[PDB]
Amino acid sequence: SMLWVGVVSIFPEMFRAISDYGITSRAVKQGLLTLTCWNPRVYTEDRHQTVDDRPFGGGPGMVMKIKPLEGALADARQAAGGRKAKVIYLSPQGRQLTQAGVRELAEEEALILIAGRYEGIDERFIEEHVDEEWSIGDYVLSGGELPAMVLVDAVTRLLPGALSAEEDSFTDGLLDCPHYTRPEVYADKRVPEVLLSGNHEHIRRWRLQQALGRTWERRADLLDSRSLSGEEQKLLAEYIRQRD
Amino acid sequence: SMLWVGVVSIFPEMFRAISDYGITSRAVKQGLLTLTCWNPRVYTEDRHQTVDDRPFGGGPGMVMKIKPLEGALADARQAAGGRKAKVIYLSPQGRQLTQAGVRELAEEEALILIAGRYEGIDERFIEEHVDEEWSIGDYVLSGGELPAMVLVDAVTRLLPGALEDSFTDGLLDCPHYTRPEVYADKRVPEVLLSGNHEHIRRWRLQQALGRTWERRADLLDSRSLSGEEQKLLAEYIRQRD
Ligand SMILES: Nc1ncnc2c1ncn2[C@@H]1O[C@H](C[C@@H](N)CC[C@H](N)C(=O)O)[C@@H](O)[C@H]1O
Ligand SMILES: Nc1ncnc2c1ncn2[C@@H]1O[C@H](C[C@@H](N)CC[C@H](N)C(=O)O)[C@@H](O)[C@H]1O
Ligand SMILES: [Mn+2]
Ligand SMILES: [Mn+2]
Ligand SMILES: [Mn+2]
Ligand code: NA
Ligand code: NA
DSSP: OOEEEEEEOSOGGGGHHHHSSHHHHHHHHTTSEEEEEEOGGGGSSSTTOOSEEOOTTOOSSOEEOHHHHHHHHHHHHHHHTTSOEEEEEEEEEEEEOBHHHHHHHTTOSEEEEEEOOTTOBOHHHHHHHOSEEEESSSSOOSOSHHHHHHHHHHHHTTSTTOOOTTSSTTSSSSOOOOOOBSOSEETTEEOOHHHHHOOHHHHHHHHHHHHHHHHHHHOTHHHHTSOOOHHHHHHHHHHHHHOO | OOEEEEEEOSOGGGGHHHHSSHHHHHHHHTTSEEEEEEOGGGSOOSTTOOOEEOBTTOOSSOEEOHHHHHHHHHHHHHHHTTSOEEEEEEEEEEEEOOHHHHHHHTTOSEEEEEEOOTTOBOHHHHHHHOSEEEESSBSOOSOSHHHHHHHHHHHHTTSTTOOOOTTSSSOOOOOOOOSOSEETTEEOOHHHHHOOHHHHHHHHHHHHHHHHHHHOHHHHHTSOOOHHHHHHHHHHHHTOO
16 A cells, blocks of 8 residues: 555544545555554553543543553554654644645655544653644644544545545645536526636636635735736736626 | 534535544533434435536536535525524635634534535535635545534534633643653653642643744734733743753
């Protein structure tokens, strides 16, 4: 396989959402992706120990112990074999996931994703064993399982033969253009005429202007980090004066 | 139920990740959350159950056809009953989901989440039927199913009785420690083992402030840093190598 992924989670069977459905399922079948789970409860000191314990200093919730996690990671590294496995902890305190980040992660041989639960995992585990911390965004979820599946799904799309990933939002810093399909007219709304009767340069130009315009209206910060050209400044100026 | 959620998806089986697990599963059981799926493949009139069609203007991929989506939303809106249902489309082109956004969505009685597939859904469906578009972040996924579950999970945490946070009041969370006191030559900070609530309260606030400053200074700029916090953060900064 092109990419080996090992997931450290207390709910391995949640990962059926990506292993049984979509591109990730197809990539596993096609052999582009190997997906494996490692339950920390199977690695406790003895069968009478929980993965979690009480936080030192008080406060709400439970914290995940270092020993169950350290066991699961050791066993997962062993299964990675000769691959250079990057150990990622899914955390709201990590590097914000972006398409550029997804392209970087898609070049790795192996990835060991650590899906936290409760209030989090012990800092000494992160300090010792985690290579990088990643966030899917600025919000708090109950576990790192949906974030790990978000990472895996975004990365898998970029694997050769998995799917257009070179016609997307955040590829050239722009948002995508609108998409239209049959019928030509639906509920008093017709498909733009350029898509129906325009040539491949008219379509290329209308699609670029719509992408520029949508990015300007919704995600202005995206244009600040992406210096527009003279063609684009003209197409966007036209969009602004014509949006109504 | 406190919150009714209807999901329009071609893979309703994927939603077992939230219906069988955690807080969302617990909230369904506790009756705080009603979760339902509406497969557009059931609102199609052919032998192989088609939801996709070819895009106008050319280019790669398929676009999701209106009729299957029209059907599933109509049926979902009927099931919402007398609830004020907000129709959200999960899109990388929508409003970026943040904790403040999660707090706003948690005040709604009903939500109809539209989980797209392929290259997207027809713009005329979004223009006609969708109230707001939401993104989970600046990256592209193959479908709107993981994003819809991300929304539902973040919102459910804020439902009274479902369960301070890393994006609440500006700051990121402090580090967490548990048993043993010493592991592989690494000991838990002494403040945490001491037992003085004010010492712990101030150390924890300082570590949050410090972690936010180091990693997410942007969060701090858009925050009302008190005299207590300015002092604790100044101390965090000056007392590090
Ligand atoms: N936005 C996110 N992106 C990636 N992982 C997340 C995100 N939100 C929550 N998590 C995961 O969910 C786990 C459990 C969370 N309830 C704890 C969050 C923690 N109390 C904090 O505020 O940082 C975390 O340890 C992460 O693994
Ligand atoms: N970051 C995201 N946040 C919310 N939904 C997403 C996100 N990424 C992809 N999607 C969903 O996945 C569907 C299919 C995507 N492959 C299409 C994305 C589209 N080509 C674009 O660049 O905007 C979209 O219609 C959305 O429903
Ligand atoms: Mn596209
Ligand atoms: Mn139109
Ligand atoms: Mn917290
Ligand atoms: Na035609
Ligand atoms: Na705190």
